[PDB]
Design an enzyme around this catalytic site. Sequence first.
Site, short mmCIF file in Angstrom:
data_model
loop_
_atom_site.label_atom_id
_atom_site.label_comp_id
_atom_site.label_asym_id
_atom_site.label_seq_id
_atom_site.Cartn_x
_atom_site.Cartn_y
_atom_site.Cartn_z
N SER A 66 -47.02 -69.74 -77.52
CA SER A 66 -45.78 -69.41 -78.24
C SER A 66 -45.65 -67.97 -78.78
O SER A 66 -44.58 -67.60 -79.27
CB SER A 66 -45.54 -70.39 -79.37
OG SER A 66 -45.01 -71.60 -78.84
N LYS B 115 -42.71 -65.82 -77.78
CA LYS B 115 -41.36 -65.94 -78.35
C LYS B 115 -40.88 -64.77 -79.19
O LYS B 115 -39.68 -64.52 -79.31
CB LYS B 115 -41.23 -67.25 -79.15
CG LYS B 115 -41.30 -68.46 -78.24
CD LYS B 115 -41.67 -69.76 -78.98
CE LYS B 115 -41.81 -70.91 -77.98
NZ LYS B 115 -42.20 -72.17 -78.68
N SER C 263 -41.19 -72.51 -83.81
CA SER C 263 -41.78 -72.59 -82.49
C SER C 263 -41.08 -73.62 -81.61
O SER C 263 -41.69 -74.23 -80.73
CB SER C 263 -43.25 -72.90 -82.63
OG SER C 263 -43.96 -72.40 -81.55
N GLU D 137 -41.00 -73.41 -70.98
CA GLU D 137 -41.70 -74.39 -71.83
C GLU D 137 -41.44 -75.72 -71.14
O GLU D 137 -40.33 -75.92 -70.60
CB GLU D 137 -41.12 -74.40 -73.25
CG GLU D 137 -41.41 -73.14 -74.09
CD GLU D 137 -42.86 -73.05 -74.50
OE1 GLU D 137 -43.25 -72.05 -75.12
OE2 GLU D 137 -43.64 -74.00 -74.20
N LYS E 64 -46.62 -64.80 -85.78
CA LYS E 64 -46.23 -65.85 -84.82
C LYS E 64 -47.50 -66.39 -84.23
O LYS E 64 -48.34 -65.63 -83.72
CB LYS E 64 -45.34 -65.29 -83.70
CG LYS E 64 -44.93 -66.38 -82.74
CD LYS E 64 -43.83 -67.26 -83.33
CE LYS E 64 -43.59 -68.58 -82.53
NZ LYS E 64 -44.66 -69.58 -82.69
N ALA F 98 -50.36 -72.16 -79.55
CA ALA F 98 -51.34 -73.20 -79.27
C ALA F 98 -51.08 -73.70 -77.86
O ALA F 98 -49.94 -73.79 -77.43
CB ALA F 98 -51.17 -74.32 -80.26
#
Lengths: 263, 165
Positions: free
Chosen positions: A45, A48, A105, A141, A209, A212
């Site tokens: 993530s 992002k 997230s 994603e 940020k 995982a």
Amino acid sequence: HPETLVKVKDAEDQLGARVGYIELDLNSGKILESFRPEERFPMMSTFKVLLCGAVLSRIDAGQEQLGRRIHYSQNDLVEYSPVTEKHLTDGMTVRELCSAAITMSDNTAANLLLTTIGGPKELTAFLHNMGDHVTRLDRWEPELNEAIPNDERDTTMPVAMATTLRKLLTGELLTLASRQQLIDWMEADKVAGPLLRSALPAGWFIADKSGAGERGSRGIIAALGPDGKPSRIVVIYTTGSQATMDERNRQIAEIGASLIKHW
Amino acid sequence: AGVMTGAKFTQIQFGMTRQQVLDIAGAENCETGGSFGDSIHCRGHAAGDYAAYATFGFTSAAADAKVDSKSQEKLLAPSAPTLTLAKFNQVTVGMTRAQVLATVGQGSCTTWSEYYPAYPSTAGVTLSLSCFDVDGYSSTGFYRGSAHLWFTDGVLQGKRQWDLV
């Protein structure tokens, strides 16, 4: 910086996996210290923030509107989308999508935002154009989180990520308005409490940020400093470990506790 | 007491007040306002890059509004996950919820979301299901074989899957 590299080593020994680390000086852009700064790790993530930096540059150039409302449907919803799922009927503005993507997230928000810019290839082209020829986004994603061994898809290097983040937060790449928004989104991060924030002393600023993924992949990018003012960029990545998430977070938190102590 | 859980999710029912939701979920686990509007968002254990969670929607922003919407990710585990890509492939738009469940397996799905726009009537009810194969579900990590099935008035509107074999 001093003693933090034994901890990075210790962490590598506790987790039994690779750990990439780099501390950069926000102002000068000079590397203060590093460990495996040039090995690839899955971004997870943490991408992002790069995504919304690209969105913000488009806003700056009149190509996009933070207030534009995006209407999506059930087909677009993916795993881990707390904000987008709740606003499914009314939609969300580009600004709300970045806020969800960065602070919560939200995965569907990121996919929606990727679509507004042309997909993973366009984020990569954006990065390539600003001097980063290492970082690459290939998938949407949730696939980008697979962290398959030796797979270079959806990866970056600590050094490339730290420098790109520095350029986004302090360059002329974005307007002061866009920089305020991007850093504020990171400042308002609500899901990274177990990592660097857990070792952050009172009065300290941090805009971050986290990320995982599978294969024990865990990471974080941040701009932090004492006296409520950021002065350094820290980028930490790990992948391959078999330890629990709490252990993986604990190690990252300890790295942070060390870099703070020897600031 | 504890963080938000599947048990708490099942105990909260459509028609309940805000206070009833908080009492069951534990106010310490919930929030409202901000990005959730007048909905109540309650957090479960850490998971992936966020956490298991539930979100409860209400008929209006009034203090006496009732629950007309329940959503969650990673609180509920499938009872007996038997879905496979082949069965997913047999799922067809226009099927009734009963038919879909017959195809993917009676215990392969959990409710991702259920909303009654005309609460308490069921007219227009939207149903979003998360279904998994044997090893697909993960409440603390990332799924490894799952599907999303959504209906309106009990009729399947669409489907999508990720990593099923």
